[PDB]
Amino acid sequence: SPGIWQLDCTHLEGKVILVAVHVASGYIEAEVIPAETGQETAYFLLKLAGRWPVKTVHTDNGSNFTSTTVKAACWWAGIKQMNKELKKIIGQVRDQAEHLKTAVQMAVFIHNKKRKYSAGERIVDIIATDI
Amino acid sequence: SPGIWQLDCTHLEGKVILVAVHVASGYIEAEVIPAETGQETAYFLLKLAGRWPVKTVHTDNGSNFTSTTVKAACWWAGIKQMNKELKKIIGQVRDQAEHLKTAVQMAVFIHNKKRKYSAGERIVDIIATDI
Numbered sequence A, B: 001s002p003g004i005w006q007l008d009c010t011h012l013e014g015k016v017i018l019v020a021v022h023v024a025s026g027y028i029e030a031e032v033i034p035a036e037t038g039q040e041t042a043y044f045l046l047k048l049a050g051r052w053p054v055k056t057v058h059t060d061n062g063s064n065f066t067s068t069t070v071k072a073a074c075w076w077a078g079i080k081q082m083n084k085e086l087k088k089i090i091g092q093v094r095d096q097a098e099h100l101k102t103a104v105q106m107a108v109f110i111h112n113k114k115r116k117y118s119a120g121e122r123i124v125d126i127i128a129t130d131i
Ligand SMILES: Cc1sc(-c2ccncc2)c(C2=CCC(C)(C)CC2)c1[C@H](OC(C)(C)C)C(=O)O
Pocket: A096, A097, A098, A099, A100, A102, A103, B038, B039, B040, B042, B043, B046, B068, B069, B072, B073, B076
């Protein structure tokens, strides 16, 4: 179903990568964040909801969505309540970039553009059909 | 035409807002960035290209795309070479948030979801049709 996303944090090189997966397509977004924090999750969610129609969000760590600030973001935006593959692509490009955050965006790009239709094409097709 | 984006920086409250417009739909993305810099433009471009099919990018300040690091990002991603409306929406929500960056994402959300089909619906329809 087209408005369902999955959100989780992973660790790499002593930093935090917030990864969101659009479950029906496999499309991803990701950001290196300074801390695993309510404020960062909330700000991420706000940015995601403005780009895509985010109806419902699932996670593998329910306590992630417990903060008042996360709930306030989901309230405002109308939201209700791959780590291994991405790390693989990160590992392949890591040496091409200085910053981990740059490697992550390179891996996100590679992941979404790859013919597995790419995940980037599938999300758009899924969402459009749904309108 | 569906792969064409417009990119520019504006100023508000002594900070820099990078704004990208998907020209065919009016859909926007935006980020408050610490400095008007080649590195920030390049990193933004990398994040945008991974989410949407960005073929060509236009700007109102050509010297923005002059840095070696911007060119390297456009090279890697295969890219070739509203400020008033957004500021208006920012002004309407500003008092609801502490951080300007949060107000900007709220304004982006409002702008893309508004029935003017919303710009968020139009980009997806435009891009899907094109596949
Ligand atoms: C801090 C730098 S300098 C630089 C660069 C400069 C000149 N020519 C190639 C790469 C780069 C790039 C590396 C790979 C790329 C495909 C994202 C393009 C730009 C970066 C890059 O950080 C950015 C994206 C500028 C914040 C990095 O983490 O290495």
